[PDB]
Design a protein around this ligand. Sequence first.
Ligand SMILES: O=C(N[C@@H]1CNC[C@H]1c1ccccc1)c1ccc(Cl)c(COc2cnc3[nH]ccc3c2)c1
Length: 284
Amino acid sequence: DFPRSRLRFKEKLGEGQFGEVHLCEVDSPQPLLVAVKILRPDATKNARNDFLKEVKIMSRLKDPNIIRLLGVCVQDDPLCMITDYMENGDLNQFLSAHQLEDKAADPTISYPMLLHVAAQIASGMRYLATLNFVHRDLATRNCLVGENFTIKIADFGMSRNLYAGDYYRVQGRAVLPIRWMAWECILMGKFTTASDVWAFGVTLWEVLMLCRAQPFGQLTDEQVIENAGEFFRDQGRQVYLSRPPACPQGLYELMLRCWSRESEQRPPFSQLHRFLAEDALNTV
Ligand SMILES: O=C(N[C@@H]1CNC[C@H]1c1ccccc1)c1ccc(Cl)c(COc2cnc3[nH]ccc3c2)c1
């Protein structure tokens, strides 16, 4: 374990339902930067329980493209959770700050780098699928960026003010990221690896949009939920995200497969990874 006194708190990186995250320095790792989650100052008994369960969940996750648990604070110390610090933060904010490189002639990013970003996400999801672990909230806002466009999948919950518009809230119900959700999730509220594939399709759409636009952004929440009904009724009235400017038709057809009505017809993450890492390179 690790002593809290050995951590040197530098800045606040975020705040959630049952904890808050700080950038810390460590001078005796056994000047190293890490991210540390601690209880909120109004921490309840309920929050502490959720914190302990989060540690158990994160102890499971061991993959280059999933955030990893480096340690926890000592038994006697106030609770903390330590992970790698991803120095470029939020993938949504990161991509937002770039535009697609102009081949003919302001930080930019190339189409092959967008493929590399998306492939890393697919590799992380491929790993989670081997654990039969369902993410339930895959989106660029839940991905983190490190050095050299390294991507790790995380999950920061559904309460951040910055992304409030990405969730549909009804009193007494689970909060729902409806614009990322497969039709069967919207109608029947249950999540699978196949619905993670659907969300990956939307996440891939985000990446190729350079996070410039909300999925179905000109449709209301009510219209997005009704669209799920049109998938169910299967009478050809359902609608899809449009092809991003940066997205070749061949890659768009991959995305459309992620949004297949039948869960079994959606590509597995192994197929998605292969396409993004290899096939798509002839579309450059
Ligand atoms: O995502 C976490 N927890 C989810 C929720 N439950 C299980 C787990 C999960 C992982 C992966 C997939 C699904 C769920 C989580 C927990 C603690 C900490 Cl400190 C961080 C890292 O925060 C960082 C690291 N670098 C940063 N740079 C700039 C900001 C920033 C924040 C993330």
